[PDB]
């Protein structure tokens, strides 16, 4: 899809079966979702915003369906105010900005 | 341009006479500038972000050539690590999402 920006670019994902919704953000390095249930392992890291800093936990090749496109990779969560897909994982379904 | 999303996706701007390179991000509403000397009248503002809020200074109608296209609108100068043009001033030099 081409998707304007006069709205937020919001989008359904599903992972670790669950359903959310998720800003497509090319200003984000790194996908950070906010608190939720995920499987596995992980390590703590910690990543800065425009307020300050937040602890997260870091979880590797984890599979994320965004808007119908599969994508495996880093997700980060913790305490972030919204679900945030970065640019590691927008680059795998192929996304650009045009103008 | 087309831009790819392996790397930021940094632009040139023209702002108040002087020359920046700024961050082009979807995920952010405003446009929200390092400290910087601009001319006009301001109001204070709070915004918030991954780690919390800052104090910026907003300022109303200001012109920018963003990858050389020119818009006017609201800018917020203050402590953001990072330059951003944001979607109040990405729509009006048409950039659009796609995959
Ligand atoms: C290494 O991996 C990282 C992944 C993400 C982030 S980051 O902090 O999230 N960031 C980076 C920016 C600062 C370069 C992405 C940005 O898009 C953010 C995304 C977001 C959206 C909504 C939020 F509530 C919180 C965060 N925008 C934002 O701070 O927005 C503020 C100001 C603009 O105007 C408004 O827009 C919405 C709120 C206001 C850092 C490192």
């Given at each position: 899809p081409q998707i304007t920006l006069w709205?937020?670019?919001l989008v359904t994902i599903k992972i670790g079966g669950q359903l959310?919704?998720?800003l497509l953000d090319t200003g984000?390095?790194?996908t950070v979702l906010e608190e939720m249930?995920?499987?596995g392992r992980?390590?703590?890291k910690?990543?800065?915003g425009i307020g300050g800093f937040?602890?997260?936990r870091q979880y590797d090749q984890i599979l994320i369906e965004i808007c119908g496109h599969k994508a495996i990779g880093t997700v980060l969560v913790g305490p972030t105010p919204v679900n945030i897909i970065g640019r590691?994982?927008?680059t795998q379904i192929g996304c650009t900005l045009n103008f």
């Open positions: 709205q937020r670019p959310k919704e998720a984000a390095d790194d249930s995920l499987p992980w390590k703590p910690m990543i800065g937040i602890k997260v590691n994982l927008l």
